[PDB]
Design a protein around this motif. Structure first.
Motif, PDB file in Angstrom:
ATOM      1  N   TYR A 186       0.486  -1.401  -0.235  1.00  0.00           N
ATOM      2  CA  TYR A 186       0.231   0.077   0.604  1.00  0.00           C
ATOM      3  C   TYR A 186       0.677   1.223   0.218  1.00  0.00           C
ATOM      4  O   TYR A 186       0.432   2.107  -0.658  1.00  0.00           O
ATOM      5  CB  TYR A 186      -0.887   0.121   1.167  1.00  0.00           C
ATOM      6  CG  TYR A 186      -1.891   1.293   1.181  1.00  0.00           C
ATOM      7  CD1 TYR A 186      -2.139   1.663   0.334  1.00  0.00           C
ATOM      8  CD2 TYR A 186      -2.365   1.948   2.806  1.00  0.00           C
ATOM      9  CE1 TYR A 186      -3.135   2.975   0.325  1.00  0.00           C
ATOM     10  CE2 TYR A 186      -3.055   2.269   2.534  1.00  0.00           C
ATOM     11  CZ  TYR A 186      -3.916   3.610   1.794  1.00  0.00           C
ATOM     12  OH  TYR A 186      -4.078   4.498   1.271  1.00  0.00           O
ATOM     13  N   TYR A 245       2.510   1.759  -2.944  1.00  0.00           N
ATOM     14  CA  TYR A 245       1.113   3.110  -3.977  1.00  0.00           C
ATOM     15  C   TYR A 245       1.122   3.774  -3.587  1.00  0.00           C
ATOM     16  O   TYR A 245       1.405   4.248  -5.000  1.00  0.00           O
ATOM     17  CB  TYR A 245       0.021   1.687  -3.543  1.00  0.00           C
ATOM     18  CG  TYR A 245      -1.226   2.453  -4.104  1.00  0.00           C
ATOM     19  CD1 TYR A 245      -1.427   3.082  -3.718  1.00  0.00           C
ATOM     20  CD2 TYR A 245      -1.827   1.281  -5.764  1.00  0.00           C
ATOM     21  CE1 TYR A 245      -3.288   3.705  -4.406  1.00  0.00           C
ATOM     22  CE2 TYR A 245      -2.892   2.308  -5.805  1.00  0.00           C
ATOM     23  CZ  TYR A 245      -3.428   3.366  -5.253  1.00  0.00           C
ATOM     24  OH  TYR A 245      -4.492   3.438  -6.024  1.00  0.00           O
ATOM     25  N   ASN A 274       3.935   5.962  -4.940  1.00  0.00           N
ATOM     26  CA  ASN A 274       4.535   5.813  -7.262  1.00  0.00           C
ATOM     27  C   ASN A 274       2.987   6.142  -7.570  1.00  0.00           C
ATOM     28  O   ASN A 274       3.437   6.719  -8.950  1.00  0.00           O
ATOM     29  CB  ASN A 274       5.115   4.087  -7.048  1.00  0.00           C
ATOM     30  CG  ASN A 274       6.156   3.949  -7.112  1.00  0.00           C
ATOM     31  OD1 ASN A 274       7.523   4.692  -7.260  1.00  0.00           O
ATOM     32  ND2 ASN A 274       6.306   2.888  -6.416  1.00  0.00           N
ATOM     33  N   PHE A 275       2.382   6.362  -7.214  1.00  0.00           N
ATOM     34  CA  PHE A 275       0.789   6.798  -8.061  1.00  0.00           C
ATOM     35  C   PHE A 275       0.651   8.169  -7.715  1.00  0.00           C
ATOM     36  O   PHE A 275       0.390   8.405  -6.982  1.00  0.00           O
ATOM     37  CB  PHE A 275      -0.070   6.245  -8.185  1.00  0.00           C
ATOM     38  CG  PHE A 275      -0.331   4.621  -8.515  1.00  0.00           C
ATOM     39  CD1 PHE A 275       0.515   4.464  -9.965  1.00  0.00           C
ATOM     40  CD2 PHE A 275       0.194   3.472  -8.227  1.00  0.00           C
ATOM     41  CE1 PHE A 275       0.721   3.400 -10.806  1.00  0.00           C
ATOM     42  CE2 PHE A 275       0.308   2.107  -8.318  1.00  0.00           C
ATOM     43  CZ  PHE A 275       0.538   2.055  -9.378  1.00  0.00           C
ATOM     44  N   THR A 278      -4.531   8.852  -6.046  1.00  0.00           N
ATOM     45  CA  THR A 278      -5.022   7.715  -5.950  1.00  0.00           C
ATOM     46  C   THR A 278      -6.840   7.756  -5.745  1.00  0.00           C
ATOM     47  O   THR A 278      -7.431   8.862  -6.130  1.00  0.00           O
ATOM     48  CB  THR A 278      -4.764   7.594  -4.144  1.00  0.00           C
ATOM     49  OG1 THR A 278      -5.507   9.253  -3.737  1.00  0.00           O
ATOM     50  CG2 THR A 278      -2.960   8.168  -4.231  1.00  0.00           C
ATOM     51  N   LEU A 328       4.211   2.184 -12.999  1.00  0.00           N
ATOM     52  CA  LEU A 328       3.270   0.695 -12.687  1.00  0.00           C
ATOM     53  C   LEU A 328       4.799  -0.111 -12.178  1.00  0.00           C
ATOM     54  O   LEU A 328       5.144  -1.051 -11.470  1.00  0.00           O
ATOM     55  CB  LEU A 328       1.781   0.356 -13.764  1.00  0.00           C
ATOM     56  CG  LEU A 328       1.103   0.821 -13.621  1.00  0.00           C
ATOM     57  CD1 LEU A 328       0.403   0.015 -14.787  1.00  0.00           C
ATOM     58  CD2 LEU A 328       0.398  -0.253 -12.440  1.00  0.00           C
ATOM     59  N   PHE A 350       6.506   0.996  -8.934  1.00  0.00           N
ATOM     60  CA  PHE A 350       5.327   0.557  -8.095  1.00  0.00           C
ATOM     61  C   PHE A 350       5.797  -1.017  -7.569  1.00  0.00           C
ATOM     62  O   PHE A 350       5.952  -1.641  -7.229  1.00  0.00           O
ATOM     63  CB  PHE A 350       4.123   0.747  -8.893  1.00  0.00           C
ATOM     64  CG  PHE A 350       2.843  -0.223  -7.611  1.00  0.00           C
ATOM     65  CD1 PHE A 350       3.010  -0.354  -6.458  1.00  0.00           C
ATOM     66  CD2 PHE A 350       1.975  -1.507  -8.259  1.00  0.00           C
ATOM     67  CE1 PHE A 350       2.190  -0.872  -5.422  1.00  0.00           C
ATOM     68  CE2 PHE A 350       1.782  -2.089  -7.923  1.00  0.00           C
ATOM     69  CZ  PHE A 350       1.585  -2.444  -5.751  1.00  0.00           C
ATOM     70  N   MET A 392      -7.235   0.473 -12.579  1.00  0.00           N
ATOM     71  CA  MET A 392      -7.004   1.814 -11.313  1.00  0.00           C
ATOM     72  C   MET A 392      -7.826   2.873 -12.618  1.00  0.00           C
ATOM     73  O   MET A 392      -7.763   3.758 -12.111  1.00  0.00           O
ATOM     74  CB  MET A 392      -5.555   2.357 -12.116  1.00  0.00           C
ATOM     75  CG  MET A 392      -4.553   1.335 -11.299  1.00  0.00           C
ATOM     76  SD  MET A 392      -3.070   1.593 -11.094  1.00  0.00           S
ATOM     77  CE  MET A 392      -2.281   2.777  -9.847  1.00  0.00           C
ATOM     78  N   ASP A 409      -8.594   2.385  -1.954  1.00  0.00           N
ATOM     79  CA  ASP A 409      -6.982   2.538  -2.722  1.00  0.00           C
ATOM     80  C   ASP A 409      -5.721   0.475  -1.636  1.00  0.00           C
ATOM     81  O   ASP A 409      -4.695   0.639  -2.751  1.00  0.00           O
ATOM     82  CB  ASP A 409      -5.986   3.637  -2.033  1.00  0.00           C
ATOM     83  CG  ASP A 409      -6.362   5.045  -3.299  1.00  0.00           C
ATOM     84  OD1 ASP A 409      -6.204   5.064  -3.541  1.00  0.00           O
ATOM     85  OD2 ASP A 409      -7.142   5.568  -2.150  1.00  0.00           O
ATOM     86  N   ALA A 443      -4.149  -1.790  -4.135  1.00  0.00           N
ATOM     87  CA  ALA A 443      -2.736  -1.928  -4.275  1.00  0.00           C
ATOM     88  C   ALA A 443      -2.524  -3.226  -4.405  1.00  0.00           C
ATOM     89  O   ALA A 443      -1.698  -3.488  -5.246  1.00  0.00           O
ATOM     90  CB  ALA A 443      -1.775  -1.343  -2.718  1.00  0.00           C
TER      91      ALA A 443
END
Length: 265
Positions: A9, A12, A15-16, A19, A86, A89, A119, A171, A175
């Motif tokens: 998580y 996640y 890196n993103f 959300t 990605l 991640f 996503m 989220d 993840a």
């Protein structure tokens, strides 16, 4: 197992750029945040391509571009960018980085579009989706109005999204779900299948226990997420078939080389 879950998580969260939490607060589910400019036709699209900025492509629309092709290029920018996230991640999870680089590329090659589409749901509602890091909202009707090749590659994604958002995942749920899609020991050319299968099973057992806690009242949710992974498999299969036709019949539209390396086989 849940400590392994929190580590996924956080990978996640780190890196993103977008959300679901943040996306939901923009279109206002309850906790409204701020603004989104609506692109629903050529005029507003032109205004967005100036106002909310973007700068990088935005070239003419007659000699070898046109409203529909320009929208497709924007889709490509977006998918190539999500591919980079990605990748980071996946690399942020120890087991994934322990695998030999060739196996890491194989995993990402066959699972990045399945994750992208899962996503996509986070920033989608019945009427449209956010673009430009949430600064804009493109209507579903406008997308449908595009020429017939490009106007129907995105529509089936909406149908998936709507039905996917009904599961009301958060989220933390995502993840693990995404990690499970990427660590799939069933991908073509995988060198170390046993090791991958082992990491996958672990992700899936942490996911199951996580829902147990997070969604104590939802029944048959875990097996339901399993069917979704299968549906995502078929969605990408249809997506690739459509990308194949654009490559064959849309001679003027360029294709990003990276996305070209993914579909090739």
């Amino acid at each position: 197992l849940k400590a392994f879950s929190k580590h996924i998580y956080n990978a996640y969260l780190k890196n993103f750029n977008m959300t679901k939490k943040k996306a939901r607060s923009i279109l206002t589910g309850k906790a409204s945040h701020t603004a989104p400019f609506v692109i629903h036709d050529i005029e507003t699209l032109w205004q967005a391509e100036k106002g909310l900025v973007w700068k990088q492509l935005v070239n003419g629309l007659p000699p070898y571009k046109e409203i529909s092709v320009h929208v497709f290029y924007r889709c490509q920018c977006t998918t190539v960018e999500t591919v980079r996230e990605l990748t980071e991640f996946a690399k942020s999870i120890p087991s994934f980085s322990s695998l030999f680089l060739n196996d890491q590329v194989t995993l990402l090659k066959y699972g990045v579009h399945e994750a992208i589409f899962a996503m996509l749901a986070s920033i989608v509602n019945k009427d449209g989706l956010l673009v430009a890091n949430g600064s804009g909202f493109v209507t579903r009707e406008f997308l449908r109005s595009l020429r017939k090749p490009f106007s129907d590659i995105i529509e089936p994604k909406f149908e998936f999204a709507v039905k996917f958002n009904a599961l009301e995942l958060d989220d933390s749920d995502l993840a693990l779900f995404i990690a499970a899609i990427i660590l799939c020991g069933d991908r073509p050319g995988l060198m170390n299948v046993p090791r991958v299968e082992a990491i996958q099973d672990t992700i899936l057992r942490a996911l199951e226990f996580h829902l147990q806690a997070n969604h104590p009242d939802a029944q048959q949710l875990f097996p339901k997420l399993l069917q979704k992974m299968a549906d995502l498999r078929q969605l990408v299969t249809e997506h690739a078939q459509m990308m194949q036709r654009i490559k064959k019949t849309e001679t003027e539209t360029s294709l990003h080389p990276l996305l070209q390396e993914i579909y090739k086989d």
